[PDB]
Design a protein around this ligand. Structure first.
Ligand SMILES: Nc1cncc(Br)c1
Ligand SMILES: Nc1cncc(Br)c1
Ligand SMILES: [Cl-]
Ligand code: NA
Lengths: 305, 301
């Protein structure tokens, strides 16, 4: 029993984190095979960052301007290039700790584990969800740039996020490992802000199923609804629209608990319109939306890596 | 900025989990140097659940009754002994991935990371705290016994918990790595119940200081309180008593934010009185008590 915000075991990714220094800036890199990946803004001064021309800034740098340390060993940079907003540093040694991996781009509402690092040294791991506004509510301080987000499917690490910047509201923005930003953001010092966020409806429903599995049932009711009728309610309370694919994905949980998705949607309807009346669900007085249906199934089944 | 329930990176512990089989029972073990640590109830049968005599059960076992799988490799058990409620299996290979480590017994209110494991392979990592009633609110399925809790100070792994059983209320009980249970519990299937749980007051205060550090001040007030008046109010909400030790420990956070500890105690009194009135603190509509003062300083500033 029990339900916790749970991250993937981070060992496979810890073995890939290195320190990257360019000039006075030091941050984190991801060392896979013979390439270290890191944010391209590591090459900017404070003045450069107001209006950077990254190709121009890069052509002035030589390989020996990129100090890379793996633990206590220095890595020899033999090449450097750009892909979108990530810098790729070819090094002279393949990482002997390279796991089986893929670069994947995730969708809003999907979750991943974040390995927070500083000076190439992992300091903490936590679970994140890509918000519908393409930010993440992470916990980062100065020097965290280059920390990566990931999932593990079987033995393969799926790298999906690299941290670049913090937004004025305290939320965070980054790219996939091919340098493409999540959301309408750019790597430079300019006026930027997160859009208005919404709640991930399929994730809340998954979390209500997790609550039922764990004995928390006070919110169940006799009623059911229709997708059309629930999505009017969802729109009204700033919830993402629930599609038919979401209902299909919740299929397993619906059969395992005997509570149909539209049956649960009536529970969520009533919760949105009336609140929780002084009660809690899985120890929370808020509706938690950072557990995917896959997260709930995996934690309530014991899948390992 | 931001504040998250944050676990330690689990890699150093991942390299120590193995599978321990005895009879038909399989659980997890902790492989450090040439010793594998695991719950001693791995040797119980279905008959030995209520009143096992562990000394009698163990004296009947030889080394080759214990199957220890590290990844795909069978380790050879060359010795076995019992220390309180943990079995210590001597193996013929020292773990090459053994980190800097030590065993520490923690006090209620302390936090640690849990590496949940099944069949010697890690499933996930999450943050826990020793409740005042000496249980932990974990996420554990059948086969998770032997999963360990830990902190990582610098590069030294402080092993502080090993999982043994789940109580009828869905909470979990275990031992330190010397086999001594936390709380009044025993490794028997006899009726056991956790005491009434209370809120870890010093941790809530630290978490409110964390909220101020990240720029939130709406819950403060112009009042203060004596330590005794605060405790008289707080235990009416099932909060742990706040000691002078707790007030001293909150000293650095009080200095960093400029809010005296007893001024933060007056704010907490008012929160208990008023609720949140629709607002949140660091993303929660509840007062969070599983961040210690040490945790806040490690994550904030
Ligand atoms: N560089 C940086 C990234 N994320 C958060 C902060 Br605060 C700083
Ligand atoms: N053996 C066991 C341990 N923890 C939780 C459960 Br449910 C079972
Ligand atoms: Cl302690
Ligand atoms: Na219903």
């Amino acid at each position: 029993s029990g339900f916790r915000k749970m991250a993937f075991p981070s060992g496979k990714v810890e073995g890939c984190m290195v320190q990257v220094t360019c000039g006075t800036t030091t941050l984190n890199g991801l060392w896979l095979d013979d390439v270290v990946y890191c944010p391209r803004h590591v090459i900017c001064t404070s003045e450069d960052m107001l209006n950077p021309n990254y190709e121009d800034l890069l052509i002035r740098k030589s390989n020996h301007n990129f100090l890379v340390q793996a633990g206590n060993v220095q890595l020899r940079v033999i090449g450097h290039s750009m892909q979108n907003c990530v810098l790729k540093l070819k090094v002279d040694t393949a990482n002997p700790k390279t796991p089986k991996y893929k670069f994947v781009r995730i969708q809003p509402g999907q979750t991943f584990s974040v390995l927070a690092c500083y000076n190439g040294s992992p300091s903490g791991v936590y679970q994140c969800a890509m918000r519908p506004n393409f930010t993440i509510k992470g916990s980062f301080l100065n020097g965290s740039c280059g920390s990566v987000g990931f999932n593990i499917d079987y033995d393969c690490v799926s790298f999906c996020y690299m941290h670049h910047m913090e937004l004025p509201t305290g939320v965070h923005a980054g790219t996939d490992l091919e340098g493409n930003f999540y959301g309408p953001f750019v790597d430079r010092q300019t006026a930027q802000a997160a859009g208005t966020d919404t709640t991930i409806t399929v994730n809340v429903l998954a979390w209500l199923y997790a609550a039922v599995i764990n004995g928390d049932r006070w919110f169940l009711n006799r009623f059911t609804t229709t997708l059309n009728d629930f999505n009017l309610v969802a729109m009204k309370y700033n919830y993402e629209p629930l599609t038919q694919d979401h209902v299909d994905i919740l299929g397993p949980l619906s059969a395992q608990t005997g509570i149909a998705v539209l049956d649960m949607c009536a529970s969520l309807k009533e919760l949105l319109q009336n609140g929780m009346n002084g009660r809690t669900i899985l120890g929370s007085a808020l509706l938690e939306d950072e557990f995917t249906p896959f997260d709930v199934v995996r934690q309530c089944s014991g899948v390992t890596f």
